[PDB]
């Protein structure tokens, strides 16, 4: 019975979906697919597609059946074909597929757009299994594609798309007809799809892309979802369609994105931000239009945006803005961090505590940014070098929390370059440095900073009166240090003493002579490194100093030269 | 790949669900009832608001922004006049494809059904299903056009009718 | 950084386990509610009141918890009274009471100097009682106090407390005399001695562990007494608990130095006397002077004891011992032989880390200071597989100690065999270098095999940066002893650098220095090396350039004096030669000139700074 | 001030962490991968959260909780060790291994506070875990080294606290150092050199641990361990590509006096590290025994022969059979570097050094059979590391 056939089918599908006796359902599913009624053919097909596996008569009947159904035009032929095609798609045997294709062909010849749509979609699933079918069926597609109906076109398209994924060669043959169809579409969805497809065909066949792009953009321009505002974008960005010939397309797409990016919801943003950045790598002009969007994205809360922005910011900068932005990021990260690092608030207006929010490794990037800003071009214009100096010391503080050592390294190298230049600022830097060194926080994690500080002071110990306490600092801290640092400190101090001697004319002052003695005692302490290399490296300097002492005795001014006299001597003795 | 399509009435009644790949067969029904509740809490403008959810968010308040993810399953919801459509997709199909396919499915359903009733959708579960598939096939939505989609459904109905005990 | 570390713990902390103390009271077991009382105030009252009751038993319960409140620093809380009451009550004749009370006293002192004083007075009265069980504990707290004013008391006490024959008291009277002897020299030392003595001679672990923790202090200053007392201590350790042993280590480290028989008449006639060992003078007989820690069975017994402790299976005791075993040692301590056998024995036994290192170390330090004691253990320390990087590293230093000239071949065969064969860790290779450095120091005829072995490793392998830096440091040492083998060593290294214009930055550094250093031996040749380097410096890394300088520099020097008058250059007067008119400025200069110019082209300041000077001085003589 | 104590494992893994109210979160550590070097560290931050790591875990655990302030390093080492010992007793003292730690991690935390406060039948069960590094050279197995670790425990059933004397004997091996447990007394005079006095705990008490090095002992005592201490394994090559024959006899001739071996576990490792366990397929065809169980773990490349305590007095469980290196691949090159056969014996009522006890009794001015009885079944344990016979 036709009515029970339909009912069985509903329930049969439930049993067949279990991995249950399909024999009981098959007979029915088959006689059902053999019943001319278009509805039964529809449901039957859905079930058989789940059940057909293994039983031969089942499948066999199902096939020979779908044929008779397809063969006759059928006149509610739209549905009959339509479903029967879907159905056949999910059954696969070569015998079946063989029939199916010959059937889809006849079905494509139905007038009614409904039928023309399904037949197209079906040929999609089928072809995915049995290519011989496609072969005999292609010729028809070309005849159907030329139908006046916009839905049929939309379908022929989708199908040609899948088949492009598998066969592109046949469908690059039909692409021209695809263009002509899209040219006649008024519908927003049909436009969106035809776009996805052409994108797929474009990866294979630029000729299509060129012909189709201009059909898209006229289509997006006429539709407002926004849905195509995203789609055309993803397609434009993908086919790599874009290539520039396609900028115009991309433009409209971007303009639609920019409008959206410009709503505070991460769902739309992220999608745009990504699409933007990507576009920019591809289209600088767009970027310049989207500076504002970027700057705004800096205060965005979305982890992918923030990261995507910083990468954009990096490319976009105004100096006054830089200096400001730096200070701004400093506070953000003390308050944007955490949220999904860990918890989980609800995101409303309400939490008065706000959920808040950064990843975990975004902190490191933040600092890096600061340093970059100071060095791009020559923030020769941090006008206020002071601030930079401060910031640098500050960042060093927070990073002590993170480490990543490299955060801390970059900060140091930069500091050195700052102090070197900018003799003013030295006092601030020295005062801080001196304290930072004896303030333990630098020793924690931070050998690099120490290495730099060491150099800085030798250069500027000339500002400070008591170049004695400084050097007694540094000398007390040397034993607390890593090998890299130790190697540095040693090397620095020596680089310094050479300076004082140049400036000491105060009197030479006797004190400088005493201080050299101290440095000596210290370096002896580092000759006690476990690794022979480092050890030998230090012991080398210890001896060096003891020398400078003898030099100052003979002269005042002549000291730098004197040191280059003895020091190398010692050095050679040891090495010799 | 869409692994599943969900149709629900404005009053949250499930009615259809498509599942392309193996997923729990029984829980599917239940899961569909759960993700209904959330739909009701979301606002009409935030209609559907695809509900992404960590799973433990199926009736879970460990996280304040309770939502239902159906474990690793993104749920896209769309609200239309009176029907809602939920689509469960895998993380590998494009979100847009999923969204569009939904939006389209909607306009189609409206035109496909002159006066959709929760009941008319039930009986015509297969029909509704077909539309969904057609839209999908060869990865392709091949008619997208709301005018065609409308007929398409009618066509399928005609066929199925002609076959109906194999269908009804 | 600290975040993750903390979380990992915290996370488990909280829920760990069933909220602590709220589940602590709620589900406490029978006495599962105390958690909320004394947890939420036992209360001082429950204390004081119980102290002002006159009965030694009641002062006990009150003394128990009473220790808690004090521990809370509830600061508000006269602590003086509890302190006082408990002090007067200490004079009670009950032992349990005395115990608690002492526990307390120790707390107060942890925070406050005045009170610390009272607590001491009490312990005096009770110490003057004939009861040994009390006089003990009581004297104990007097010691865990940290302080110095607590001496004019603890004394008159400790006096009568030694004069008691009891072991309990004898243990405690040591703690006191001590933790009190640190701060009271003027009124105290007369007695604080004739005491600690008779004492130390007790058996009870809580008595010994105490006199120890004691003697370790008082003596910081009045060490004559301490001695005759320190002995039993070292003896006692051999009979005792692992805790009571570790403590004796820290002390044995502190007291001898604190003492060392400050020379005053120092009887160098005590035993076999080095620093004279006193026994106490006010003691009888045969004067034993001071320096006595260096000399006196106390210092010595320290080493023997340390051993037993090592034999005793407790690693802590084993390390702390090895540490002091080497620190004191007049080496005559280390030729124990015991340290050796026991060491090597422990080594294999030890699976405890602080130990292996100490163990393997000992082996070396001990071989060095005593070879003949290891020879039976040679084939033994052919490395054990389980062991760490430092371990295999120490194995090398051992072989280096066992060599003779006639036996040397037997050994070396093993060494090289290790580098190549063992699966040696990187660090091992580094050490193997520091060792062989000391091995050839002994033989010359055999040294060639040693050095050659080292070079061959470097010349050939592009070795790891760490290793390269190491080897370079070593080769620097051997060259220092074996200047004949030295010349080759340098030439070989030069060639390697000359080919490798790519080498490693750290390698070039070492390789260069070595060449400065070796130049003394035959600084006539070294220019040959520096020649190639210069020619090719211009293409090098910075640090590498720095060293290359100082070392060009040195090489130049050694010979200025020897070059200068020799270098006062092309002055030909120097190609004339006394001793070191090494073909001098010319050969050396031709090299430096290149070097300097090359260093200037490096980055670091020190590199250039030295380079600049080296040239200036070298040039001008 | 907060004091936090954490028991780490060998490779610094933290196992337990103790909190003390309110709210709370390099040369040696560089080394600890090796099991015993953890002591001082400074985790350090500027806040006075200084924690000193003196580093001792006993029984494979690392404990290292830093204090909140001052305290001193070595001072913290003492508090740490004490913490170590109370936990085993709480567990029962049988074995605080990292595994147990985790489980008992809570009881350990509770202790830390409790310690932090802390202001009739007798039996001597001498358990003796030997470990001996034998080197086969010349046909006989020559005990090269070895360590017999005797723990002497005693399980009592008195009612009060009488004293015990235990007479130990030398099995002419100068027995040299018996180490005695904290509830045990070894007055140099009062108790002869071979005897010790024990005071109750309720608790199992290790009465004496003893370590003896077999190399000189065995040579000094002349003992080819016939009964025990020398299991002569003869691995004969003349092998074919798959077989070999090794004869190992563990005669209980000198162990006749001894009760048996609560559990002799012979793990023969056949190096498979350098040969690929598939190469080592080996089979042990014949195992000579009268009272134990030989199951082979071939796959893993291991012998395990477990002799149950059941063999009594002098029966000689012959150890012999054949090792056949069966190969599933041909890629076994008939090489099995034959490496270290560690035999860990555990003899329960034997003396690790030869600390043989003829008899034990309460000793208070009393006479024998003044009313005190003698029990059976203290149980000590003893472990070192482990015998090794090299071939």
| 3-class SS letters over B29-96 | HHHHHHCCHHHHHCCCCCCCCCECCCHHHCCCCCCCCCCCCCCCCEEEEEEECCEEEEEEECCCCCHH
| d(C-alpha A68, C-alpha A73), whole Å | 9
Q: Which DSSP string corresponds to A117-180?
A: HHHHHHHHHHHTT-HHHHHHHHHHHHHHHTSS-HHHHHHHHHHHHHHHHH-HHHHHTTHHHHHH
Residues of B in contact with A29 (CB under 8 A): 166
Whether A511 and A561 share a structural domain: yes
Q: Quickly tell me which residue has 């042993």 as its tokens.
A: C245
Q: Say how many CB pairs under 8 Å bridge A and D.
A: 5
> Mind telling me how many Å the CA of A520 is from chain D's nearest CA?
25
Residues A383 and A412 in one domain: yes
* Cβ pair C192, C181 in contact under 8 A: yes
Q: Are residues D256 and D300 in the same domain?
A: yes
Residues A477, A539: one domain? yes
Could you give the CA distance from residue D324 to residue D311 in angstroms, rounded to a whole number?
28
Chains C–D, number of C-beta pairs less than 8 Å apart: 118
Q: b/e string for C314-345 if b means 16 or more Cβ within 10 A?
A: bbbbbbbbbbbbbebbeeebbebebbbbbbbb
Cα of A149 vs its chain's centroid, Å = 42
Report phi then psi at B83, rounded to 5.
Answer: -110, 150
Does A398 reside within a domain?
A: yes
Is A85 within 8 Å of chain B by CB?
no
Report how far Cα B76 is from the mean position of its chain's Cα atoms. 8
d(CA D209, CA D187): 16
Residues D298, D341 within the same domain:
yes
D207 and D334 belong to one structural domain:
yes
User: What was the elucidation method?
Assistant: cryo-EM
Compute the nearest-CA separation of A194 from chain B (Å): 8
Between CA C281 and CA C285 the distance in angstroms is: 7
Q: Which two tokens stand for residue D48?
A: 């006075």
Same structural domain, A488 and A546? yes
| B7 domain-assigned | yes
Q: How far apart are CA A172 and CA A160, in angstroms?
A: 9
For the record, the structure tokens of C427 come out as: 């660090």
Query: Which tokens hold the place of A362?
Result: 């975004």
Strand, helix or coil at D150? strand
- Is residue A68 within 8 A of residue A84, CB to CB? The reply is no
Residues C497 and C509: their CA atoms lie apart, in Å, by 11
Whether residue B90 lies inside any domain: the answer is yes
| Domain interval for residue D58 | 7-117
Choose one of A420, A449, A478: the last residue of a domain. Answer: A449
All residues at 6 or more sequence positions from C105 whose CB lies less than 8 Å from its CB, including other chains: C83, C86, C87, C90, C119, C123, C141, C142, C144, C145
Distance CA D308, CA D40 (A): 45
Contacts of A435 (CB under 8 A, 6+ apart): none
Q: Is residue D1 part of a domain?
A: no
Rounded Cα gap, residues A302 and A292, in angstroms: 17
Contact B166, A8 (CB under 8 A): yes
Cis before A44? omega within 30: no
Q: Which residues of C touch D119 (CB under 8 A)?
A: 64, 67, 99-100, 103
Contacts of C67 in chain D (CB under 8 A): 117, 119
In chain C, ranges of CATH 1.25.10.10 domains: 378-620
Classify A305 as helix, strand or coil.
Answer: helix
| Cα dihedral C427, C430, C432, C438 sign | negative
Is the dihedral angle over the CA atoms A118, A121, A125, A127 positive or is it negative?
A: positive
- Compute the distance between CA of residue D212 and CA of residue D216 in angstroms, rounded to an integer: 9
Shared domain check, D362 and D234: yes
Q: Which domain holds residue A410?
A: 317-449
Residue B153, domain CATH? 3.30.450.60
Among the partner-chain residues B66, B103, B142, the one whose CB lies closest to the CB of A121 is B142
Q: Do A431 and A323 have their domain in common?
A: yes
The domain boundary residue, chosen from D117, D133, D159: D117
Q: Which residues contact C459 (CB under 8 A, 6 or more apart)?
A: C492, C493, C495, C496
Over B102-133, what HEC string results?
Answer: HHHHHHHHHHHCCCCCHHHHHHCHHHHHHHHH
Q: What is the CATH number of domain C378-620?
A: 1.25.10.10
Residue B81 lies in a domain: yes
A155: chain B residues, CB-CB within 8 Å = 134, 140-143, 148
Q: Match 């190491």 to its residue by tokens.
A: C470
For residue D222, the Cα-to-chain-centroid distance in whole angstroms is 25
- The reply to whether D203 falls in a domain is yes
Nearest to D229 by CA among D128, D304, D321: D128
Residue D48 touches chain A, beta carbons under 8 Å: no
| C-alpha span between B162 and A80 (Å, rounded) | 8
Residues of A in contact with C620 (CB under 8 A): 561, 565
Contact B132, B88 (CB under 8 A): no
Distance CA B52, CA B67 (A): 6
The reply to whether D81 falls in a domain is yes
| Cβ-Cβ contacts under 8 Å, B66 against chain A | 346
Contact present, A443 and D26 (Cβ < 8 Å)? no
For residue A236, what are its two tokens? 């434009």
Chains A and C touch, contact meaning at least 3 pairs of CB atoms under 8 angstroms apart: yes
Gap between the Cα atoms of A364 and A445, Å rounded:
14
Q: Are residues D169 and D198 in the same domain?
A: yes
Token pair belonging to C368: 């060095």
Please tell me what resolution, in angstroms, this structure has: 10.5
Per the CB < 8 A criterion, the answer to whether D288 and D259 are in contact is no
Q: Which of D208, D144, D197 is nearest to D382 (CA)?
A: D208
Interface probe for A, chosen from C464, C592, C605, C607 (most Cβ of A below 10 Å), is C605
Phi, psi angles (nearest 5°) of residue A78: -65, -50
- Determine the residue of chain B that is closest to A160 in CA distance: B138
How many domains does one find in chain D?
2
Cβ burial, residue D84 (10 Å; 0-12/13-18/19+): buried
- Is A322 within a domain? yes
Nearest CA in chain B to A164: B138
A256, part of any domain: no
Q: How many domains does chain B have?
A: 1
Cβ atoms within 10 A of the Cβ of C77, count? 16
What's the token pair of residue D68? 């909140």
Chain A contact for C15 (CB, 8 A cutoff): no
Instruction: Please indicate, yes or no, if residue B148 is contained in any of the structural domains.
Output: yes
Are the C-beta atoms of residues A36 and B163 closer than 8 Å to each other? yes
Contact B149, B46 (CB under 8 A): no
D98, D353 contact by CB (below 8 A) = no
Residue A329 near residue A370 (C-beta atoms within 8 A): yes
Q: Is residue A253 part of a domain?
A: no
CA distance D69 to D56: 20
How close is the nearest chain A Cα to the Cα of D109, in Å? Answer: 27
> Rounded to the nearest 5 degrees, what angle is found at the Cα of A155, between the Cα atoms of A151 and A157?
120
What is the four-CA torsion angle of C428, C431, C436, C437, rounded to 10 degrees? 160
Q: Is residue B168 part of a domain?
A: no
Q: Token pair for residue C99?
A: 């115990």
Nearest CA to D180 among D159, D166, D190, D170? D166
β-bridge partners, D39: none
Alpha-carbon distance of D333 to D336, in angstroms, equals 8
Say if residue A442 is in the same domain as residue A332: yes
d(C-alpha C154, C-alpha C185), whole Å:
12
Determine the Cα–Cα distance for residues A30 and A9; give it in Å rounded to an integer.
Answer: 10
**B and C touch per CB criterion (3+ pairs under 8 A):** no
Question: And the tokens for C48?
Answer: 């004081």
3-state secondary structure A7-53: HHHHHHHHHHCCCCCCHHHHHHHHHHHHCCCHHHHHHHHHHHHHHCC
Sorted by sequence, the CB contacts under 8 Å of residue C460 that are 6+ apart come out as none
Integer CA distances (angstroms), D212 to A123, C313, D177, D178, D251, in order: 87, 11, 8, 9, 21
**A301 assigned to some structural domain:** no
**Residue D370 carries which DSSP code?**
B
Q: Of C313, C150, C148, C176, nearest to C245 (Cα)?
A: C313
Task: Tokens for C480, please give them.
Answer: 């220092």
d(CA D346, CA D127): 6
Q: Which residue segment(s) compose the domain that B137 sits in?
A: 2-163
Q: Note the Cα C244 to chain centre separation in Å.
A: 20
Q: Do A373 and A408 sit in the same domain of this protein?
A: yes
The answer to whether the CB of C556 falls within 8 A of the CB of C592 is: yes
**Helix H or strand E encompassing C234:** helix C219-237
**Which backbone phi and psi does D185 adopt, to 5 degrees?**
-115, 125
Closest by CA position to B32, among listed B95, B86, B82, B102:
B86
Tokens of C574: 């120097």
Could you tell me which chain B residue has the CA closest to the CA of A114? B152
Cα(C51)–Cα(C49) distance, rounded to whole angstroms?
5
Tokens of C423: 């699966």
d(Cα C264, Cα C283) in Å, to the nearest integer?
Answer: 17
D46 close to A (CB below 8 A): yes
Q: Distance between CA D132 and CA D128 in Å, rounded?
A: 12
d(CA C585, CA C301): 62
List the beta strands (DSSP E) in chain D.
7-8, 62-63, 122-137, 140-156, 164-170, 178-180, 184-185, 195-198, 205-213, 232-236, 245-249, 261-269, 283-284, 292-297, 302-307, 323-324, 341-348, 355-362, 388-390
Closest CA to C173 of C137, C206, C148, C122: C137
Residues D215 and D346 in one domain: yes
Look-up: residue for tokens 């000198």? D254
Helix, strand, coil % over all residues of chain C, rounded to 5: 65, 0, 35
Instruction: Give backbone dihedrals phi and psi of D285, rounded to 5 degrees, phi first.
Output: -65, -45
D267: helix, strand or coil: strand
Query: For residue D7, what is the DSSP state?
Result: E
Which one of C3, C518, C618 has the shortest CB-CB distance to A576?
A: C518
Helices (H), chain D: 73-91, 98-117, 214-221
Give how many domains chain A has, as a whole number: 2
Boundary (domain end) residue, out of D84, D117, D150: D117
Q: Could A346 and B154 be called an inter-chain contact, meaning their C-beta atoms sit closer than 8 Å?
A: no
Closest CA to C555 of C607, C611, C603: C611
Rounded to 5°, angle at Cα A300 from A294 and A304: 85
- Give DSSP secondary structure letters for A446-474: -HHHHHHHHHHHHHHTTT-S-HHHHHTTT
Radius of gyration of chain C (CA): 34
Among A462, A458, A463, A460, residue whose Cα is nearest residue A474: A458
**Gap between the Cα atoms of C173 and C197, Å rounded:** 10
| C104 φ, ψ (degrees, to nearest 5) | -50, -65
**Whole-angstrom Cα distance, residue C63 to residue C50?**
8
- A439 and A321 together in one domain: yes
Looking at CA atoms only, how far is residue D218 from chain C in angstroms? 16
What are the tokens at D259?
Answer: 């009760």
Which CATH number describes the domain made up of C22-217?
A: 1.25.10
| Contact yes or no for A367/A407 (Cβ under 8 A) | yes
**Given the DSSP bridges, would you call strands D292-297 and D205-213 parallel, antiparallel or unpaired?**
unpaired
Minimum CA–CA partner of A440 in chain D? D46
A450 prior amide bond cis, ω within 30:
no
* Chains with ≥3 CB–CB distances under 8 Å to D: A, C
Token pair listed for A278: 């990507």
- Strands D302-307 and D261-269 turn out to be antiparallel
CA distance readout (Å), C30 to C41, C152, D111, D119:
19, 48, 18, 22
Report the distance separating Cα A461 and Cα C606, nearest Å. Answer: 16
Contact D228, D345 (CB under 8 A): yes
Give the whole-angstrom CA distance, residue C509 versus residue C501: 13
Residues A434 and A482 in one domain: no
Tell how strand D122-137 and strand D388-390 pair up: parallel
A279's enclosing H/E stretch is helix A268-282
Instruction: Tell me how close the Cα of A567 comes to any Cα of chain C, in angstroms.
Output: 7
Coil vs helix vs strand at C36: coil
């Amino acid at each position: 019975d036709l009515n029970s056939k339909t009912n069985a089918v509903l329930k049969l599908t439930y049993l067949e979906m279990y991995g249950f006796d399909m024999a009981w359902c098959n007979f029915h599913i088959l006689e059902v697919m053999s019943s001319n009624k278009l509805q039964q053919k529809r449901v039957g097909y859905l079930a058989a597609s789940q059940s057909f596996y293994k039983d031969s008569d089942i499948l066999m009947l199902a096939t020979n059946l779908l044929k008779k159904d397809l063969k006759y035009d059928g006149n509610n032929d739209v549905v009959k074909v339509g479903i029967a095609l879907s159905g056949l798609s999910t059954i696969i045997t070569p015998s079946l597929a063989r029939d199916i294709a010959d059937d889809l062909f006849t079905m494509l010849n139905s007038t009614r757009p409904y039928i023309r749509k399904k037949a197209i979609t079906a040929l999609f699933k089928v072809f995915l299994q049995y290519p011989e079918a496609l072969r005999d069926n292609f010729d028809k597609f070309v005849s159907k594609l030329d139908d006046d109906d916009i839905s049929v076109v939309s379908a022929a398209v989708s199908v040609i798309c899948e088949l492009s994924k598998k066969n592109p060669q046949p469908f690059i043959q039909l692409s021209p007809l695809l263009y002509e169809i899209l040219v006649t579409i008024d519908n927003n969805w049909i436009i969106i799809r035809l776009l996805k497809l052409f994108t797929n065909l474009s990866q294979v066949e630029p000729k299509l892309r060129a012909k189709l792009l201009p059909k898209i953009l006229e289509l997006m321009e006429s539709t407002v979802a926004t849905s195509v505002i995203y789609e055309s974008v993803n397609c434009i960005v993908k086919g790599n369609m874009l290539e520039e010939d396609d900028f115009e397309t991309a433009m409209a797409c971007l303009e639609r994105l920019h409008t959206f990016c410009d709503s505070q919801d991460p769902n739309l943003r992220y999608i745009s931000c990504i699409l933007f950045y990507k576009i920019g790598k591809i289209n600088t002009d767009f970027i310049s239009r989207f500076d504002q969007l970027i700057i705004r994205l800096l205060s965005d809360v979305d982890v992918s945006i923030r990261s995507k922005a910083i990468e954009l910011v990096e490319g976009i900068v105004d100096e006054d803005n830089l200096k400001a932005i730096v200070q701004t990021l400093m506070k953000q990260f003390v308050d944007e961090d955490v949220v999904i690092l860990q918890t989980g608030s609800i995101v409303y207006e309400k939490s008065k505590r706000i959920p808040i929010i950064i990843p975990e490794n975004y902190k490191i990037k933040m600092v890096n940014v600061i340093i970059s800003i100071c060095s791009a071009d020559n923030y020769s214009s941090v006008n206020d070098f002071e601030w930079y100096n401060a910031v640098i010391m500050d960042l060093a503080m927070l990073c002590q929390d993170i480490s990543d050592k490299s955060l801390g390294s970059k900060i140091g190298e930069q500091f050195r370059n700052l102090m070197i230049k900018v003799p003013s600022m030295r006092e601030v830097t020295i005062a801080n440095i001196i304290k930072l060194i004896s303030n333990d926080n630098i020793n924690k994690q931070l050998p690099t900073v120490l290495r730099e500080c060491i150099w800085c002071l030798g250069e500027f110990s000339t500002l400070v009166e008591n170049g004695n306490d400084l050097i007694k600092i540094m000398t007390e801290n040397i034993s607390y240090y890593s090998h890299s640092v130790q190697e540095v400190l040693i090397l620095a101090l020596v680089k310094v003493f050479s300076n004082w001697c140049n400036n000491f004319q105060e009197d030479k002052r006797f004190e400088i002579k005493m201080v050299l003695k101290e440095l000596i005692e210290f370096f002896e302490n580092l000759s006690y490194s476990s690794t022979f290399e480092v050890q030998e490296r230090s012991v080398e300097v210890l001896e060096f100093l003891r020398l400078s002492l003898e030099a100052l005795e003979e002269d005042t001014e002549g000291l730098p030269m004197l040191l280059s006299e003895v020091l190398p001597s010692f050095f050679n003795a040891y090495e010799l | 790949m869409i692994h599943a399509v969900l149709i629900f009435n404005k009053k949250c009644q499930p009615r259809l669900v498509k599942f392309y790949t193996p997923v729990d067969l029984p829980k599917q029904k239940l899961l569909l009832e759960q993700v209904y509740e959330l739909i009701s809490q979301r606002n009409s403008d935030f209609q559907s608001s695809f509900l992404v959810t960590p799973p433990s968010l199926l009736l879970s308040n460990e996280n304040n922004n309770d939502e239902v993810n159906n474990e690793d399953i993104q749920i896209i919801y769309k609200n239309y006049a009176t029907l809602y459509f939920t689509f469960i997709v895998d993380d590998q199909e494009s979100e847009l494809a999923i969204l569009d396919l939904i939006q389209t499915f909607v306009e189609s359903l409206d035109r496909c059904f002159t006066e959709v009733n929760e009941l008319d959708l039930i009986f015509n579960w297969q029909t509704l299903e077909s539309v969904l598939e057609e839209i999908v096939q060869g990865g392709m939505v091949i008619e997208t056009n709301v005018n065609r989609i409308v007929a398409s459904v009618d066509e399928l109905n005609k066929a199925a009718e002609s076959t109906d005990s194999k269908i009804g | 950084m600290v975040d993750s570390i903390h979380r990992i713990a915290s996370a488990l902390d909280t829920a760990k386990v069933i909220t602590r103390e709220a589940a602590a009271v709620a589900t406490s077991k029978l006495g599962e509610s105390s958690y909320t009382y004394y947890s939420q105030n036992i209360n001082p009252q429950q204390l004081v009141t119980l102290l002002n009751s006159r009965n030694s038993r009641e002062v006990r319960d009150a003394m128990k918890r009473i220790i808690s409140i004090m521990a809370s620093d509830d600061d508000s809380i006269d602590v003086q009274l509890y302190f006082a009451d408990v002090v007067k009550n200490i004079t009670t004749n009950d032992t349990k009471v005395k115990r608690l009370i002492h526990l307390y006293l120790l707390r107060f002192a942890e925070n406050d100097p005045n009170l610390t004083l009272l607590s001491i007075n009490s312990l005096q009265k009770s110490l003057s009682d004939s009861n040994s069980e009390l006089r003990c504990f009581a004297l104990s707290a007097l010691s865990d106090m940290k302080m110095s004013s607590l001496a004019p008391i603890i004394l008159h006490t400790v006096k009568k407390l030694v004069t008691d024959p009891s072991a309990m008291v004898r243990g405690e009277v040591a703690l006191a005399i001590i933790k009190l002897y640190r701060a009271g020299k003027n009124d105290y030392h007369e007695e604080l001695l004739d005491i600690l003595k008779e004492l130390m001679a007790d058996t009870d672990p809580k008595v010994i562990s105490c006199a120890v923790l004691a003697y370790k202090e008082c003596y910081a200053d009045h060490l004559e007494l301490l001695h005759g007392h320190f002995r039993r201590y070292c003896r006692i350790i051999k009979q005792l608990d692992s805790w009571s042993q570790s403590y004796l280590i820290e002390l044995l480290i502190k007291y001898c130095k604190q003492y060392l028989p400050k020379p005053t008449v120092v009887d160098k006639s005590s035993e076999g006397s080095p620093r004279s060992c006193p026994l106490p003078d006010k003691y009888n007989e045969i004067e034993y002077p001071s320096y006595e820690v260096v000399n006196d069975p106390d210092l010595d017994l320290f080493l023997q004891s340390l051993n037993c402790l090592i034999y005793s299976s407790n690693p802590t005791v084993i390390l702390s011992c090895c540490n002091a075993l080497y620190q004191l040692a007049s080496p005559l301590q280390m030729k124990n032989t015991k340290f050796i056998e026991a060491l090597v024995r422990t080594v294999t036994m030890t699976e405890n880390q602080g130990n292996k290192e100490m163990l393997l170390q000992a082996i070396h330090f001990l071989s060095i200071l005593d070879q003949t004691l290891f020879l039976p253990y040679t084939k033994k320390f052919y490395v054990f597989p389980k062991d760490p990087i430092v371990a295999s590293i120490w194995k090398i230093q051992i072989l280096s100690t066992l060599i003779n000239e006639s036996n040397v071949k037997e050994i070396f065969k093993e060494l090289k065999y290790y580098v190549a064969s063992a699966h040696f860790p990187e660090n091992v290779v580094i050490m193997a270098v520091k060792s062989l450095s000391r091995c050839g120091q002994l033989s010359t005829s055999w040294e060639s095999h040693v050095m050659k072995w080292l070079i061959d490793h470097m010349e050939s392998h592009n070795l790891s940066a760490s290793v390269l830096d190491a080897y370079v440091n070593v080769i620097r040492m051997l060259v220092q002893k074996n200047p004949t083998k030295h010349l080759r060593i340098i030439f070989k290294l030069a060639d390697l650098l000359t080919v490798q214009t790519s080498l490693a930055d750290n390698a070039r550094a070492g390789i260069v220095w070595l060449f400065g250093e070796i130049a003394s031996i035959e600084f006539k040749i070294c220019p040959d090396v520096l020649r190639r380097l210069i020619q090719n410096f211009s293409n090098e890394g910075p640090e590498t350039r720095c060293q290359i300088l100082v070392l060009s520099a040195k090489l130049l020097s050694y010979d200025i004096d020897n070059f200068k008058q020799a270098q006062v250059t092309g002055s030909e007067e120097n190609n004339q030669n006394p001793p070191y008119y090494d073909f001098s400025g010319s050969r050396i200069s031709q090299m430096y000139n290149a070097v300097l110019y090359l260093a200037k082209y490096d980055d670091e300041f020190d590199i250039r700074d030295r380079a600049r000077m080296i040239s200036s001085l070298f040039d001008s003589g | 001030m907060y004091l936090s104590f954490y028991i780490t494992d060998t490779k610094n893994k933290l196992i337990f962490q103790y909190l003390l109210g309110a709210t709370a979160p390099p040369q040696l550590l560089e080394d600890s991968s090796s099991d015993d070097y953890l002591d001082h560290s400074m985790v350090g931050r500027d806040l006075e959260v200084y924690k000193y790591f003196s580093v001792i875990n006993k029984l494979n655990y690392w404990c290292l909780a830093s204090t909140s302030k001052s305290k001193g390093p070595l001072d913290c080492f003492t508090f740490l060790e004490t913490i170590d010992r109370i936990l085993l007793e709480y567990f029962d003292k049988d074995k605080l291994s990292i595994k147990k730690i985790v489980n008992n991690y809570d009881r350990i935390s509770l202790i830390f506070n409790c310690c932090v406060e802390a202001g009739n039948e007798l039996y001597v069960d001498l358990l003796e875990t030997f470990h001996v590094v034998f080197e086969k050279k010349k046909s006989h197995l020559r005990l090269l080294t070895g360590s017999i670790h005797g723990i002497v425990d005693v399980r009592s059933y008195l009612n009060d606290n009488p004293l015990v004397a235990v007479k130990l004997n030398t099995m002419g091996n100068d027995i040299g150092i018996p180490s005695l447990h904290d509830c045990v007394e070894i007055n140099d005079g009062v108790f002869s050199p071979s005897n010790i006095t024990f005071i109750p705990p309720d608790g199992k008490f290790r009465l004496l641990e003893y370590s003896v090095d077999l190399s000189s002992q065995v040579k000094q005592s002349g003992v080819r361990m016939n009964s025990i201490g020398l299991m002569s394994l003869h691995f004969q090559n003349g092998l074919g590509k798959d077989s070999d024959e090794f004869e190992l006899s563990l005669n209980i001739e000198n162990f006749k006096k001894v009760s048996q071996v609560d559990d002799l576990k012979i793990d023969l490792q056949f190096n498979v590290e350098n040969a690929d366990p598939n190469e080592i397929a080996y089979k042990i065809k014949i195992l000579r025994n009268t009272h134990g169980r030989f199951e082979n773990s071939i796959i893993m490349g291991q012998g395990q022969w477990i002799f149950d305590k059941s063999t009594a007095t002098g029966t000689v469980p012959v150890l012999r059979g054949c090792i056949e290196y069966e190969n599933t691949g041909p890629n076994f090159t008939k090489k099995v570097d034959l490496q270290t056969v560690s035999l860990e014996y555990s003899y329960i009522g034997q003396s690790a050094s030869g600390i043989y006890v003829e008899a034990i009794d309460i000793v208070s001015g009393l006479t024998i059979g003044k009313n005190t009885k003698l029990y059976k079944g203290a149980k000590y344990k003893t472990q070192t590391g482990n015998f090794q016979v090299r071939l």
